[PDB]
């Protein structure tokens, strides 16, 4: 709860990846300690790959921003058609939530400006010896990231 391990996983929530990679190559058995230190090397890697993944599986996900639409709350008496009202709050937890009436977005909105997404395949075969050799057999806790790398690989042979 308190100490170095909380420091080492609060630096991954914001943006600071270069010190944490330098630590976890010195002492690799800093994992098996907290299960939360593997979920935050997955949220960084999911940002660098989501522009890539939506380009190969393009026309499905391009219509899936047209699929992601909400129901409009109508009235019975005068036959109205009204949309929904949300609120935007700021918290300290990195993963996005959505309550009964409000959304919870991360407060530090410029967290990703150090990082850069990459090109088609010749960087994904280069940015994986760095990041995915740290969490080697630990992508089983991030099961969505294991699908998005393999859905690239089937859509790369078909293309």
């Amino acid at each position: 709860l308190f100490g170095k391990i909380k420091l080492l996983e609060r630096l991954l929530i914001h943006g600071c990846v270069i010190p944490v990679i330098h630590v976890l190559k010195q002492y690799p058995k800093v994992l098996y300690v907290s299960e939360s230190l593997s979920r935050y090397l997955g949220r960084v890697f999911e940002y660098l790959l989501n522009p890539l993944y939506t380009s190969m599986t393009s026309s499905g996900e391009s219509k899936d921003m047209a699929t992601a639409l909400m129901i409009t709350r109508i009235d019975n008496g005068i036959l109205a058609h009204k949309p929904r009202l949300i609120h935007k709050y700021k918290t300290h937890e990195p993963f996005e939530s959505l309550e009964l009436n409000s959304s919870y977005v991360f407060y530090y909105s410029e967290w990703n400006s150090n990082l850069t997404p990459f090109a088609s395949v010749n960087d994904l075969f280069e940015n994986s010896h760095i990041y995915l050799s740290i969490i080697g057999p630990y992508l089983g806790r991030i099961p969505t990231l294991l699908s998005k790398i393999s859905r690239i690989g089937v859509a790369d042979i078909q293309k």
């Binding site: 989501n50 993944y53 939506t54 599986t57 026309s59 499905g60 996900e61 219509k63 899936d64 921003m65 047209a66 699929t67 992601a68 639409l69 909400m70 129901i71 109508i74 009235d75 019975n76 036959l79 929904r84 939530s97 959505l98 009964l100 099961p143 969505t144 699908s147 998005k148 859905r151």
Partner: protein, 333 residues
């Protein structure tokens, strides 16, 4: 929060000393988005539409009618129209797509039209658009149709099922409109999830993914448009988000097959009804298996349905057939 009993003639049937079978069966139940009507359907009984104005349930009994869709065939599902409050698109089993009107001033029900496109073997699925601008009538045997409602009920295009998948004679168990009204999510027999583009009048498939290895029983949608939840004949009930079309949660509570899925209008509780007469509730935003309640139902087949306006709990499952309505269930013990 108190137990209050539902007052139809099904409670009078069981209260008498009638031995063999008091009501018979329930075929379909659909809500209009206004959240004051009901389409309570039976097998050989009555399709009873309801209109209760202010009280909980003890205000008035509206209408029961056996001879509504005729006297020889049955109705698979009753689609309500989002545009017209007085319109319910009932599709009979063999060859009838009739369109009925209801009257509040009189104890009757009149019919506006009965349109039919020929060589109709068996249409079992009819459902309008969430905005009410299309009607996709889909057979489980040959092909899927597409009509309109805003001008009239006129055909535009149709697609044959064998162009979607290519394995065998597959049955279409359940399909669901998208939430924008622009896509079709259809559920096959061998566990295929195919996505069809239905913008205005063109019907073309986008992609097909292998959800699991069983008949995909139900497909529901989230009112905030983030994800969609599927069911199975296995124990699997995945939660697939829409921006990436991958899986997020897994409800692995494999004690039986899955029959009925519902969500809430806020999108919090997922209600799963299995085949061992056991119901569950879960959470969507929270972790995988975090129950709020489990309830043992009696010996007969129940049904589960959620209101579109406010969270009120409709179950069935009395001694032969009766519905139960649980009032003020924000905590549920």
């Amino acid at each position: 929060e108190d137990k209050r009993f539902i007052h139809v003639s099904s409670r009078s049937h069981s209260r008498f000393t009638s031995t063999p079978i008091t009501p018979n069966e329930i075929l379909s139940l659909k809500f209009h988005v206004s959240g004051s009507s009901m389409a309570y359907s039976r097998m050989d009984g009555s399709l009873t539409v309801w209109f209760i104005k202010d009280a909980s349930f003890d205000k008035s009994v509206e209408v029961y009618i056996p001879d509504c869709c005729g006297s020889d065939k049955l109705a698979t599902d009753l689609s309500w129209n989002p545009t017209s409050l007085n319109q319910i698109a009932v599709v009979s089993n063999s060859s009838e797509i009739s369109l009925l009107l209801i009257n509040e001033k009189s104890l009757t029900a009149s019919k506006l039209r009965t349109l039919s496109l020929g060589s109709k073997t068996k249409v079992n699925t009819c459902l309008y658009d969430p905005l009410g601008n299309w009607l996709l009538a889909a057979t489980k045997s040959e092909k899927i149709y597409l009509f309109d409602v805003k001008k009239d009920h006129s055909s535009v295009c149709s697609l044959n099922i064998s162009d979607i998948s290519q394995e065998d004679n597959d049955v279409v168990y359940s399909l669901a409109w998208s939430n924008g009204g622009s896509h079709i999510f259809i559920g096959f027999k061998s566990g295929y999830l195919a996505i069809l583009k239905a913008k205005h009048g063109i019907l073309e498939v986008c992609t097909k993914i292998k959800a699991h290895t069983g008949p995909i029983t139900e497909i529901k949608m989230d009112p905030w448009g983030r994800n969609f939840i599927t069911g199975s004949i296995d124990g699997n009930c995945y939660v697939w988000n829409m921006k990436s079309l991958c899986c997020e949660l897994i409800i692995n509570d494999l004690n039986s097959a899955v029959t009925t899925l519902d969500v809430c209008h806020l999108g919090k509780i997922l209600g799963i009804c299995t085949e061992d007469e056991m119901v569950y509730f879960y959470d969507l935003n929270s972790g995988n298996l975090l129950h709020s309640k489990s309830l043992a139902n009696y010996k007969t087949d129940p049904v589960l349905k959620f209101y579109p306006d406010k969270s009120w709990y409709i179950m069935s499952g009395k001694n032969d057939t009766l519905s139960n309505h649980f009032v003020k269930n924000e905590k549920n013990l």
